[PDB]
Write a protein that binds this ligand. Structure first.
Ligand SMILES: O=C(Nc1nc2ccc(C(F)(F)F)cc2[nH]1)c1csc(NC(=O)c2ccccc2OC(F)(F)F)n1
Ligand SMILES: CCCCCCCCO[C@@H]1O[C@H](CO)[C@@H](O)[C@H](O)[C@H]1O
Ligand SMILES: CCCCCCCCO[C@@H]1O[C@H](CO)[C@@H](O)[C@H](O)[C@H]1O
Length: 293
């Protein structure tokens, strides 16, 4: 039996994290399960304390995981969080890697709002991907949460709101599959890039895979092939067979200037108007609704 924080029983691994994997655990006192993130202290660049600080700054926002405890204990840095439900990637697989339009639009609405919230607190996320959105549990089972602040960083000064400077020659940060075109080009990430990535996530959900997925290969040619393919795929080819709003969303995000504040409301309204034009009911009945978590 393994214990951390003189309070939590450590269980088995439930997932990966940017830096440190995630384990199920039990809060022995409260008789409740929790999620426990562990980072090895001999890791080359320890990050967990920084990440926990970001979670603390995000607290109180809708769809932000609650921190219960953080501390170092011997060979591990430990972060204990409220347990959440499955990831959108888990649920996508459950659903045979295709979501209905209704589900994609219900998800888009919340996901835009999560990103907007992180931006409002002065950070960019930098790794918007299905694995980093989790559904809640119980009464919050239809709430989408955003997680993993391991790659996040400030994009503006907290007092003046002066934007970070434009620069280039940046190494890739985040998943190549969902990176913005400017991220592939080595441009410093900013708010538009989180939103562009979300655009690719929504098309991934619509399509089942993206055109730059499953390319094969030095240091390496794989990322270069992804970048080249993504950069040369016409939006209208990517989005063929799906409502025009998906291409409108992507063109909008791509046209944002480096320091522009995105019109989040416009983007949410694009999808909401479509939702209601289609005559969907906003009843939070997702494709996985037969699962009762
Ligand atoms: O990861 C889960 N919880 C979780 N709560 C967290 C709280 C904070 C953090 C943080 F990042 F440290 F902040 C991470 C967390 N991770 C979780 C709960 S259930 C599950 N996975 C399936 O049920 C499933 C797996 C594979 C295929 C299908 C799956 O379920 C379902 F429902 F999709 F079919 N994963
Ligand atoms: C909180 C409910 C328990 C979640 C169980 C889902 C576990 C499946 O998911 C996973 O567990 C694997 C082994 O099972 C690990 O090796 C992987 O890191 C992880 O993807
Ligand atoms: C309580 C009943 C819910 C059963 C949840 C099990 C979901 C298994 O999960 C999955 O679904 C498919 C079938 O294995 C596969 O295509 C996916 O890759 C796999 O991840």
């Amino acid at each position: 039996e393994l214990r951390v924080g003189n309070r939590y029983r450590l269980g088995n691994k439930i997932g990966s994290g940017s830096f440190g994997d995630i384990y199920l655990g039990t809060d022995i006192a409260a008789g409740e399960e929790v999620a426990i993130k562990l980072e090895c202290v001999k890791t080359k660049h320890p990050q967990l304390h920084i990440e926990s600080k970001i979670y603390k700054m995000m607290q109180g926002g809708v769809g932000i995981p609650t921190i219960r405890w953080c501390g170092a204990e011997g060979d591990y840095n430990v972060m204990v969080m409220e347990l959440l439900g499955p990831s959108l990637e888990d649920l996508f697989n459950f659903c045979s890697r295709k979501f209905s339009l209704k589900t994609v639009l219900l998800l888009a609405d919340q996901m835009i709002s999560r990103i907007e919230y992180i931006h409002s607190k002065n950070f960019i996320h930098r790794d918007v991907k299905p694995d980093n959105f989790l559904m809640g549990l119980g009464k919050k089972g239809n709430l989408v949460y955003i997680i993993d602040f391991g790659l996040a960083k400030k994009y503006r000064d907290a007092r003046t709101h002066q934007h970070i400077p434009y620069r280039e020659n940046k190494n890739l940060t985040g998943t190549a599959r969902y990176a913005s075109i400017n991220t592939h080009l080595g441009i410093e990430q900013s708010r538009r890039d989180d939103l562009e990535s979300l655009g690719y996530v929504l098309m991934y959900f619509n399509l089942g895979s993206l055109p730059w997925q499953g390319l094969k290969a030095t240091k390496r040619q794989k990322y270069e092939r992804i970048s080249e393919k993504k950069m040369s795929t016409p939006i209208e080819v990517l989005c063929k067979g799906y409502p025009s709003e998906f291409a409108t969303y992507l063109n909008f995000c791509r046209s944002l200037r480096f320091d522009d504040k995105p019109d989040y409301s416009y983007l949410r309204q694009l999808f909401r108007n479509l939702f209601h034009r289609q005559g969907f009911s906003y009843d939070y009945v997702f494709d996985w609704n037969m699962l009762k978590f």
